[PDB]
Design an enzyme around this catalytic site. Sequence first.
Site, PDB file in Angstrom:
ATOM      1  N   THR A 129       0.824  -1.203   0.000  1.00 51.33           N
ATOM      2  CA  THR A 129       0.000   0.000   0.000  1.00 51.33           C
ATOM      3  C   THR A 129       0.861   1.257   0.000  1.00 51.33           C
ATOM      4  O   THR A 129       1.676   1.465   0.898  1.00 51.33           O
ATOM      5  CB  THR A 129      -0.944   0.039   1.212  1.00 51.33           C
ATOM      6  OG1 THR A 129      -1.859  -1.062   1.142  1.00 51.33           O
ATOM      7  CG2 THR A 129      -1.726   1.344   1.236  1.00 51.33           C
ATOM      8  N   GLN A 130       0.678   2.090  -1.018  1.00 56.01           N
ATOM      9  CA  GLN A 130       1.416   3.339  -1.130  1.00 56.01           C
ATOM     10  C   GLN A 130       0.549   4.516  -0.701  1.00 56.01           C
ATOM     11  O   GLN A 130       1.055   5.537  -0.234  1.00 56.01           O
ATOM     12  CB  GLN A 130       1.916   3.536  -2.562  1.00 56.01           C
ATOM     13  CG  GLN A 130       3.079   2.630  -2.945  1.00 56.01           C
ATOM     14  CD  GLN A 130       4.381   3.041  -2.277  1.00 56.01           C
ATOM     15  OE1 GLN A 130       4.492   4.136  -1.723  1.00 56.01           O
ATOM     16  NE2 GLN A 130       5.376   2.163  -2.330  1.00 56.01           N
TER      17      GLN A 130
ATOM     18  N   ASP B 182      -5.523  -3.573   4.806  1.00 55.47           N
ATOM     19  CA  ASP B 182      -4.294  -4.264   5.174  1.00 55.47           C
ATOM     20  C   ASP B 182      -4.469  -4.985   6.508  1.00 55.47           C
ATOM     21  O   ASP B 182      -3.936  -6.080   6.716  1.00 55.47           O
ATOM     22  CB  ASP B 182      -3.124  -3.283   5.256  1.00 55.47           C
ATOM     23  CG  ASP B 182      -2.698  -2.764   3.902  1.00 55.47           C
ATOM     24  OD1 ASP B 182      -3.058  -3.385   2.880  1.00 55.47           O
ATOM     25  OD2 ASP B 182      -1.990  -1.738   3.861  1.00 55.47           O
TER      26      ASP B 182
ATOM     27  N   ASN C  95       6.813  -1.897  -0.251  1.00 52.86           N
ATOM     28  CA  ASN C  95       5.371  -2.084  -0.334  1.00 52.86           C
ATOM     29  C   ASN C  95       4.804  -2.398   1.047  1.00 52.86           C
ATOM     30  O   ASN C  95       4.455  -3.541   1.339  1.00 52.86           O
ATOM     31  CB  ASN C  95       5.039  -3.209  -1.313  1.00 52.86           C
ATOM     32  CG  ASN C  95       3.547  -3.369  -1.533  1.00 52.86           C
ATOM     33  OD1 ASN C  95       2.778  -2.419  -1.379  1.00 52.86           O
ATOM     34  ND2 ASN C  95       3.129  -4.577  -1.892  1.00 52.86           N
TER      35      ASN C  95
ATOM     36  N   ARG D 143      -4.814  -2.918  -5.731  1.00 51.51           N
ATOM     37  CA  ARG D 143      -5.350  -1.650  -5.243  1.00 51.51           C
ATOM     38  C   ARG D 143      -4.610  -0.442  -5.806  1.00 51.51           C
ATOM     39  O   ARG D 143      -5.198   0.623  -5.987  1.00 51.51           O
ATOM     40  CB  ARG D 143      -5.344  -1.612  -3.713  1.00 51.51           C
ATOM     41  CG  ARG D 143      -3.977  -1.831  -3.082  1.00 51.51           C
ATOM     42  CD  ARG D 143      -4.065  -1.801  -1.564  1.00 51.51           C
ATOM     43  NE  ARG D 143      -4.602  -0.535  -1.077  1.00 51.51           N
ATOM     44  CZ  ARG D 143      -4.875  -0.278   0.197  1.00 51.51           C
ATOM     45  NH1 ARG D 143      -4.663  -1.202   1.121  1.00 51.51           N
ATOM     46  NH2 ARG D 143      -5.365   0.905   0.547  1.00 51.51           N
TER      47      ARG D 143
END
Lengths: 245, 238, 125, 213, 217, 204, 234, 202, 220
Positions: free
Chosen positions: E1-2, E59, E104, H91
């Site tokens: 997740t960025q 997440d 990441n 995503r």
Amino acid sequence: SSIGTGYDLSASTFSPDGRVFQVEYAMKAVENSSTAIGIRCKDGVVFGVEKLVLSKLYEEGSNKRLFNVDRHVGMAVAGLLADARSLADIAREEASNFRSNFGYNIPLKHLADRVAMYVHAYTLYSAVRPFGCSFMLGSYSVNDGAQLYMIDPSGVSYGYWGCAIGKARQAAKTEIEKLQMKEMTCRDIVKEVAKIIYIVHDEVKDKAFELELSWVGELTNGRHEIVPKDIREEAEKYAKESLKE
Amino acid sequence: NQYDNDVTVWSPQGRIHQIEYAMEAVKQGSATVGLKSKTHAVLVALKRAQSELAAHQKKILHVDNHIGISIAGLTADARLLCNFMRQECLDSRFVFDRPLPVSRLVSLIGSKTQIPTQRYGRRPYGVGLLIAGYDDMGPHIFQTCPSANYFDCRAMSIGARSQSARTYLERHMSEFMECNLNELVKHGLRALRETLPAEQDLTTKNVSIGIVGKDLEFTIYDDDDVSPFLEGLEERPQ
Amino acid sequence: SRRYDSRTTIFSPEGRLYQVEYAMEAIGHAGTCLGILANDGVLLAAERRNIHKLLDEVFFSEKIYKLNEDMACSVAGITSDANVLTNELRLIAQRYLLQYQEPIPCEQLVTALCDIKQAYTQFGG
Amino acid sequence: RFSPYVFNGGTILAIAGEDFAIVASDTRLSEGFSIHTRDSPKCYKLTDKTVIGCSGFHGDCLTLTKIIEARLKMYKHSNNKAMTTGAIAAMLSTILYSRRFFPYYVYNIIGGLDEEGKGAVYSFDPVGSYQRDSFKAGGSASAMLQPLLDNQVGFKNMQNVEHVPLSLDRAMRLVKDVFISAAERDVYTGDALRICIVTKEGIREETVSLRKD
Amino acid sequence: TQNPMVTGTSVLGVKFEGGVVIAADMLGSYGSLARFRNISRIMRVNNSTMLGASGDYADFQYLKQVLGQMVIDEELLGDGHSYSPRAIHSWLTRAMYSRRSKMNPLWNTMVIGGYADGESFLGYVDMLGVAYEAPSLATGYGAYLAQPLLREVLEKQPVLSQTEARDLVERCMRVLYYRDARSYNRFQIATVTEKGVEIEGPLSTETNWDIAHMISG
Amino acid sequence: SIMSYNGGAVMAMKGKNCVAIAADRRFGIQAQMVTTDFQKIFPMGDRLYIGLAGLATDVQTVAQRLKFRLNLYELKEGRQIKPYTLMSMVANLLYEKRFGPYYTEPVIAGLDPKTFKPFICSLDLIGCPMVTDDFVVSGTCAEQMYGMCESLWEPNMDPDHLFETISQAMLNAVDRDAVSGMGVIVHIIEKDKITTRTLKARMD
Amino acid sequence: YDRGVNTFSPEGRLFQVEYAIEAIKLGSTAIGIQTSEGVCLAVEKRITSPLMEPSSIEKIVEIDAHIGCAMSGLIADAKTLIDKARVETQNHWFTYNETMTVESVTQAVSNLALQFGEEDADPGAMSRPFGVALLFGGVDEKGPQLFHMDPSGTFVQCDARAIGSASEGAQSSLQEVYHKSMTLKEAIKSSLIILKQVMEEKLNATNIELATVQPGQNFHMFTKEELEEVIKDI
Amino acid sequence: TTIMAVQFDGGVVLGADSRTTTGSYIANRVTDKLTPIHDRIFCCRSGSAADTQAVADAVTYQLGFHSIELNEPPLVHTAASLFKEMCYRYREDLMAGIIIAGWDPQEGGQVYSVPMGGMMVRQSFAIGGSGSSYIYGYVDATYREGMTKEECLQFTANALALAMERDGSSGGVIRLAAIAESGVERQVLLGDQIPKFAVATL
Amino acid sequence: TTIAGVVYKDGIVLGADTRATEGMVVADKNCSKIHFISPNIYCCGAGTAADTDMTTQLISSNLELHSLSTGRLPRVVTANRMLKQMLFRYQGYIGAALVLGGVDVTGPHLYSIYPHGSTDKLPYVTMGSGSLAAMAVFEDKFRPDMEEEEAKNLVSEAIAAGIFNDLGSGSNIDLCVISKNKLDFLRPYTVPNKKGTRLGRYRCEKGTTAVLTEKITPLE
Ligand SMILES: *[C@](O)([C@H](C)CO)[C@H](CC(C)C)NC(=O)[C@H](Cc1ccccc1)NC(=O)[C@H](CC(C)C)NC(=O)[C@H](CCc1ccccc1)NC(=O)CN1CCOCC1
Ligand SMILES: CC(C)C[C@H](NC(=O)[C@H](CCc1ccccc1)NC(=O)CN1CCOCC1)C(=O)N[C@@H](Cc1ccccc1)C(=O)N[C@@H](CC(C)C)[C@@H](O)[C@H](C)CO
């Protein structure tokens, strides 16, 4: 029923009469193993295993032929133990993947199908040999019901009410047929399982043996668990007493 | 004879000859004994020598602070499997900061060793192992075979003329669970010495000891450190 | 698997490669094909095995292949393998041309194909 | 975007004596302008003869620590001997340089005893450059600690002074002093000072207290 | 997740006599929008440990799936061994650092509470793999608001009763609801004792607003 | 611009039963001229020429690889190549580098080897074909060339009027561009013969 | 009848490995002796022609400044192992800034034991065992040490050991003259004596090679003159 | 866009606008945003048209094969889980806001949200799309537990109408779908059928 | 460009201009933008020329293979799926806006396919730089179930709007009518634009071009 002139050295080779002798040989390896039975009642599935003891030096509960494949699915094996364990690994991984992908506990029919396909994948090439074991998968749910399936080295999977695999497969099946498991409960069934195990056991040729037992049903919230020592000793007592008639 | 040379070939009698031939490799090595009390796990190994000018072969190997092994068979395969176990233990400590439960390590050994018994051109591991370990389920003696089958034992012996040792241990199982460390090592040494003709017996030059327990990490006693165990033993019969 | 292998790239006890010799025996049954070198040119002359009344004749030749603007070749043996090798020869020639911007010397082309054939004699099965 | 680094503070010090080696550090773990914990020593016991101090980014500190542990075990299994101090220094160099293009944000000082029983320090940079020293500081308050030790232990810039070798006692009080002074000026240094003394007898652990602001 | 999307805010933790207590509101925010006002940000990892999570909720759902699977996998063996809270904390540290090093990350900051072998456990894990142990823990704005209160008490009285810790937690959640603009007056309290892990249902925080009538004087 | 690095100009014109193709002769790097005899037109067989303008390296490289594939084609098949076929070949070759294209804009001019029917096309740097009946241009001075061609070209020109037309177009377009010129070469090709001339041009 | 290279005999051994052991018996015999003053390695060269330069026959090589190796059997196979050993020692020096123990080197080379096979393997992986036997003589922190390794990968420390064609006889002759307190000169002398006994050719200064590794001196290959000066007192 | 899904007793009600825009231009004033995944499983799409279409196709594929392999009517939670897996895994490469809703013999009428994060949660009702922002308050003040099918229908109709009125990226026509054990009842509210509200005058 | 498509009673009408530009200069005055997919399916291409070309060609080829194996007439949904999936796999890096029209065993079908891989099935669609004008013409003068000539008039009108109102469109109007049993690929359906006639003679007479070098080469 006995050909072997090079036609029996591979799973990639058919016999002139359309048979795959490697698979049948693996099945014979299943036949030479101690008998394991499993029976489905109206409220679950019970497993019983004749675990022969090769030495008094071995700890109790060593070489378990009863496995926890999933929290709701148990596995009873018969034959070459290492293969059986690897297959238990495959089944476990399949169930885990199913949960991680679809979000709920894997239905028994599907698990049996998948693992059976995996087994069958070994009855087709010369690069690998068929698994040398047969096994039974037991489970229970409220939305699904009580279910018991069985898979042989060829990859064939079927749903049973009662089933047995090993030396005295037929000798056990004739004893299971006497029961009315469609009405009985897993509580009563355990005794009968231990009984059939003691009956089918040959005290002469085979030495001492340990009896393994497994629950999976409404009495265990759908969890596949080992039968408590109390109920196990109770069933063994019932069996030893029923052997005097 | 036509079902002898490949591990992927079942015999018409439902057997795999390559696996059994691999099993025969364990009996080719020098005998070794393993037993557990309730606090300690003990391996006693009879080291073998080629000539009198050659040092005795190592038979006991360190795996982790709580796990050690005794080998019987091909030393190369033994080293391989050993390095595998070491690696798995290190992984467990790296990830969970807690020592790997022995039974799980044994399970992994089973899984790994099972694979080459089902693939063409591959071969079984030509080595038998006795695993002594301690975790929060107590001491443990395990046995692993080339057939990738493993056993949880109260006591065990594998290798050349190990039948005598087995016969001995089977009589003193009941005694084992309550022995102190010295008595346990004693029993192990007697079992080990049972696998010898009366013209020869145990020596500080040909005996190794591995000990693990609630009060002790896995340690290996080889030469002068073995004497405190040998010195305190009967004269044996003939 | 090991049973079905015919071991094509293996020395015979006398120190020779049997598949190669057998291939030579195959060539011995193919149409006669010769070539002669002169001072003002060079020529190829080959027997035609594709000689039947009903054949259509739609190509410039049958056993004569053009490889390069300065080079041509003739063939004897299995015709399909010949097709493969000739196509590959043309490829090699065009590669050399693309690289050095001049026609590939004949011996270099020959050696280039022969390295492939030898490679087929030494490994691969 | 996203930064894989965060400075967690911490000061670190090692002194090498004739028969001893001191490795000390504060116990403050912080981030930004906040305190994560006051009970986080930066000292790690590797072997009976060797102690390591790691400061900087806590993630890389933990990781590098566990790696060093694992590889110590590996060496022990491979050579049937424990890693000598200098060997651990060289190994650490290679390990640090292995991430030359994605470095561990870690300042490392190794303190211990060599093969002659004498004390030894090894100072590192985040990518593996190391050297042997009698005394070295690292971490946030490094520039505050170094100059005094240059004067008091190295006897630098002092005319007609005697070159008396550093005793364990004087070294200890020196450590406590420089840390107490650093706690005054460095905002990343405080809470508590853990000191690890390494002699032939083994490894002692002492814990002085620093201010909590 | 960025780029984190739906997120949860502060997570509190504190040790007490014979157990550990953790709190977290039931809000998933889409920026400044209180989008999902009824979600659990607390997971029961077996019977000896438990987890609260701040940051990207997706997440967290992933980690929930993975951890659940690990616990099931272990429970299948029944070999008498289980994951201690410290072990779970170590694993989680390893995982977060692994994702961090792959550039990441799992956009989460987590508090693991536990009780095993008669000892109370409380561990903190970053998205960068920064992990540690402490008697009290607070993530996000809690670390600026709740943590100062917690430390004040714990340095005046290291050992707290369950009721004392629960009170402290309640007051801290009140402060957070007052000052954190991305919080919500609907939270959960989880507790580990020797009896296991217990998550108490939707709780509200009483609020005083008398200082509304202090504009003039 | 990458195309403008070397500069240059290429043009093709249609005739009665003839065809024409011309190009400047300057090889320069940005503002400095290195060579005055740089070949930008290559014969892809008898009565079939291609002319590449743009980055010199890609001009030479595309020409060479095209000759590679062409030779292989005329070997596998027992014939000379058709103009349309050559066009599709170039298109394919260029489009293979869709996301890392050669910086050249090819222009094909020739006569059908079987018939004699004139043919002119041009392509993208990524190989999009465009066939015309009058003229095609490609280069840094494309607008000038368009300007001349739109006003000079007549339909059925004889091999002499075609020469004069394409020559005046090239000369006068190129003379309004700083990075195109230093001489002009013209190939006028017909069924019987091929006539190659270099024009008298400005050299500044 | 052909079978896989990883096939087991009914006795419980690998055919190819056993056959490699059989292959060793055709090689030049070599003797290594361990002594508290240092380790010595001697080997016959077996020159098959007067035209062959004997200095191009090296069956004793330097693994590192503190470790030397003697080999018997298929030498071409041994070259690979030697290079692997050298590389391992240098890697270890690079990583840890210290010398390798003789046992560690021997073990490292021994790890390439049963690293052969057909299916489920790399394209460049070994197809067969190494038909060679090794004697590692060197000096480390544990003093002088001598190790022996065979194609099985089984390596073991020896006080005195002979490998090669005349293995048994030379081993007996070794047992007759070894006591754990010999001087290095005695070891060299005995080695050359047994060598002269077992060799078919007349033992001279160009017929063999001898090398020593001692606590105070690096790996030293005996020159012609020194060889003569030891052969002198025959 | 502006999607919505409400759960009643024996099933669910879906609703969406029909405006598809590129920039400020309306590339399709009559989009069909309610996409059938299975016989009684629908999904509401918002975000990138290409992304949501591709994902919907893929999930229909997977769920079809899965339901055939199980020989049972697919759980709505399963479809939602496939969508969840895809949207979470990718995503950083997808712009998708999905509402998976439908009927299922084991759990009845179900509504799940899969927002751009990739998370998944079951809700009594769910709204999404750019227009959803303008109806959070209305939908909060109007929702009442135990609504009838027709009540839910009218509910989504009104909400969507309001959102479309306020949001520029939303508009066109109202598409509704009623899903229960009976089947799928789809309808279209256009023009005067779309609920109107009193606009302020003086 | 300025491509459009409409669905009438008996089938489908496809329209397109013929202007191809590079920069702000007309490179091709007559470019065919209506492409053959299958004998019953055609597709108009707007955007990156080479991309529309190679894409439409590839899908045409795959459909030929498909029908060759199936023995039936290709469906429009198939071409749509292939196109959208390929285009989506490249995440818009293939600059291909498309109008896909065809008649099936299920009837007339018209899709619009954007380079990012999204599709819309509509009774009428427009694509290209002149798509807004054409869409205005459609929104103004479209009715369901038109007659063939009526629909042809409508589409040509739309394309015309694109041609005169958009600087990106110009020149001719190409139509393609597809019914359940007819395929009218009307090339220059209308030439509404003409180059003005030359008012002078700028013909250069033989000799006016100075020559430095000459070389004649005979052929065969
Ligand atoms: C919905 O969400 C509501 C109405 C609010 O947006 C609708 C409904 C959906 C389910 C169709 N969504 C849209 O209307 C949507 C917005 C969007 C833009 C960009 C990325 C993702 C979503 N419109 C589209 O997806 C539209 C599809 C067709 C053309 C009808 N395409 C685009 O919006 C282009 C995305 C491609 C892209 C551009 C740059 C980088 C990567 C990808 N955006 C353009 O600008 C296309 N183009 C170039 C500029 O001039 C206009 C044409
Ligand atoms: C002249 C003809 C043979 C083709 C023309 N080609 C070109 O313009 C190509 C573009 C190559 C390219 C590379 C990478 C990425 C994208 C494109 N350019 C070149 O060949 C040379 N240049 C290199 C540097 O200087 C500028 C151009 C073209 O594509 N024109 C397009 C417009 C365009 C859009 C996007 C990028 C580039 C160009 C066109 O006509 N499109 C029409 C549709 C048709 C052709 C199907 C329409 O859309 C109408 C005419 C409006 O343009």
